[PDB]
Design a binder for these strands. Sequence first.
RNA 1: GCGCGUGGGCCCCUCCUGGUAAGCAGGACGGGCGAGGCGGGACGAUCCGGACGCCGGGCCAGGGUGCGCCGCCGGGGCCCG
Lengths: 51, 213, 130, 178, 156, 170
Amino acid sequence: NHTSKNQNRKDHRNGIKKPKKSAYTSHKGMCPKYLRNLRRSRANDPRQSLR
Amino acid sequence: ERATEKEKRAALVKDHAVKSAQVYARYYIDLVESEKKARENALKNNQLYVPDEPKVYLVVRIRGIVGVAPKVRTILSLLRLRQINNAVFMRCNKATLNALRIVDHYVTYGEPTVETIRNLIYKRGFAKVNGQRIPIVDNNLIDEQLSKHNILCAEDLVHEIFTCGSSFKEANNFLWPFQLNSAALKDKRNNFAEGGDFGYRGKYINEFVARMI
Amino acid sequence: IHPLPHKIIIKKRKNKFIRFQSERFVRVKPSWRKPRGIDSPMRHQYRGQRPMVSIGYGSDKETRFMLPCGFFKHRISTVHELKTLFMNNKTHAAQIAHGVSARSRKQILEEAKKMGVRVLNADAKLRKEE
Amino acid sequence: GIDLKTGIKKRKVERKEPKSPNPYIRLLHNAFKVVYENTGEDFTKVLTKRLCLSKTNRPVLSVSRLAHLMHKREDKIAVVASTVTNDERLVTIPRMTICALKFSATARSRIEKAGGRCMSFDELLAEKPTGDNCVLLQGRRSCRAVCKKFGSPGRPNSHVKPKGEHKGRRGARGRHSW
Amino acid sequence: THSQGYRCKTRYCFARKFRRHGMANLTTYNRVYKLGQYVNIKVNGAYHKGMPHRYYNGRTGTIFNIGPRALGVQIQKRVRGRIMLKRINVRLEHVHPSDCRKNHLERVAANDAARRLAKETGQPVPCLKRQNALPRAAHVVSIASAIDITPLKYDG
Amino acid sequence: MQKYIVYGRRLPSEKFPEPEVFRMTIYAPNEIVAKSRFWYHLKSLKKIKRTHGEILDCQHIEENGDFVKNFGVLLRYRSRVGQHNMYREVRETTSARAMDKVYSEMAGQCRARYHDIQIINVKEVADEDVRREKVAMFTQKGVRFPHPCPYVHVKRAARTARFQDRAPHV
RNA sequence: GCGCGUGGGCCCCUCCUGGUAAGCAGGACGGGCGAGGCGGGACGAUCCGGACGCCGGGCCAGGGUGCGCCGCCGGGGCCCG
């Protein structure tokens, strides 16, 4: 009953989809200390988006 | 305005063809003369002159599209052979030579003579323009696409493809894979080495292609 | 009365496609129906089966809809209609409609002769008067 | 037979013409297509496509957004393929030249009360088929609630609200719930 | 397969080498790993804590995060049709630096540096395109000292 | 079938900056088979694969056919039993022609194809040196035998639509 | 984005487990049939070729060429298929 024949042909029908650009550069799982300091550096001089 | 460009361009291309027909004709003669002379000189010095290994090959697909494993399908697609009795010009690089071994059962290849190049381009040769198959009936439509490559005429084309010259890639892509008549094929399942027809045939690809062109 | 010259009319298939097993049963009328069986010899298209309807059998566009006389056909049921049909028309002919009575057909034919539009069925329903 | 199923990636489908019964929209599309067939200006091709799109892909742009977007350039003529709508929040409205497919009557009144003409695409073809001094603008396409419900609400990386009442605790309160 | 624990089928891969048993060399801890650098993850059996799973062994990836005791590595894993980034936290011992991009860095240095060296001397730009082997040239070879060869009989 | 002599060498390396040239006499149908056989022999006898080697020449040899000379071929056939050895003796005008006769008997008598047989040696034997009776019988100066196949002359009955008025005599 | 069918599969290779072993029972790379006409293999859903609009030429794959039944001869060897 168990069988995986035709699984690879089915996967390669239009597959090998890459993960996505947001995934490669993300703030997920990163060191919380790194994230906090990054926000302070951004919040000054040109990068600051604060009004 | 357009009339001047067509009268001016046509003459320039026609001059390139008559002037370089003699120029290339001597260059082909030069190749035979250089090899023949060195062979004899080497024999005089008691050495054997090896000739240069082929820079270009004529690859013809001899099997069909049913039952091809996925790797073999991809390699054929890149070689632009997608149909039986179809023939393409492919450069010889370790990449191309090591890929063609993988697909040897479905193809037969060998270095092409300049009469084979001329009779393939002239009679069965077509152009990929805007992804259309436009027949090559004149040196003028060759000029518009390969104008940057300095190749301005059909004889100029045969030289670049025969010599795997600087403007080879652009020129082989410009040539729509040749669709040829049915292959003779003594045996489709065994290599020419076994007396069949698959794989390298060397000089004999000029004889095999003669009936198909 | 004489058609424009035109090109040879080539019909790809002379005989009408007939539905599978039309001969075996009266209930199965000759009208074409697509072969639909799971194990239909026709759907498979095995050797010795009846031919299958394909767009390929299509007539040349210029000859499509053209009748053997060389003119095409535009039906007319009245005289007003015939003057509209022939207006600027050297490529068409008019079959009088079946419904048109013998009395009215005389008007259509007499106008057609003046108009110059050919009538395919000019001899239909001709038996003097009542 | 030829192997055309290796490096060929199938045929995509796109809206070549508007499916709108409105003959004036259909006429403008043919006109902006005819202009771009002659002069290949990007603005004219893009307008032709934006006229073709569906209501869902043609979101409204309010006078407030147009004010912010054209703040840098008063001279440039704004172009919106969707209808323009009034902002009751924007008590004072600038002077703008806008070619919209339709204007809400309140917006038309406010823009013209501020001295700015409410142009139409018929006027745009007549004055600037080229699009010199013209900016093409679009409404936030994902403004519809339908666009925030799309997805699977329930998987851990969802950030999508459940579709319906719900009113229970399994999954509703944390991944550890369930 | 009737059992699927974390360490199933790991008898040989998670095993230490012929003469590598003991504790990891202090170079691993001293080594500096920077953000985005290519690392290669090979599980070390001795250091059980913070071990990667067997799939992420042999996989090469980029450091998404640099933390205290452990780093975070993203490697692309193929599941069915899609290839999805797996962000994993691995102890320093399991992760080592990668020389996968080293070739490009060597070529990139020579690419710019040779071009400048020739810039002072011969004007034609040096070709910087790797050609794949290519065929053979004229090549003359002496025959005078040739050896005749004949097949030997099946002695048995 | 065509008598080619091939010259080939190991690809030049830093260890072997002048590799050793090896010559072979390969009787083959075509140059492509001849160079394949040359590489097969070099692989076993000299450990050189084609991938690590270059053939420098494969020259066709043409031999005159003025007179019949006896020729001897020592070969190592392979039957389903395993590899063996065999000496043959063929009277033919040219070595390539004699080798063709050699391959056809080994096909009929011992059921071995071209690729099964390996030719250890070919040579020209004298009228004195003949070792086998068949070559010896015709080697002698005077040889008169009645026509071996007089009946073969029915090759004409094929075309005569086979309706001769009388049944032909031989 | 929006759905539909499907969720009994089976063969030919190649490596298998297992059973004494099967047109046997389970696995796997690929291909095939399923859902692929057509020619051949006498006959065979899967074998060898070829994978299909409707056609008129030509070419020719695989398999063959006494006669059924389209199409062959020539040479070397072998011989109570």
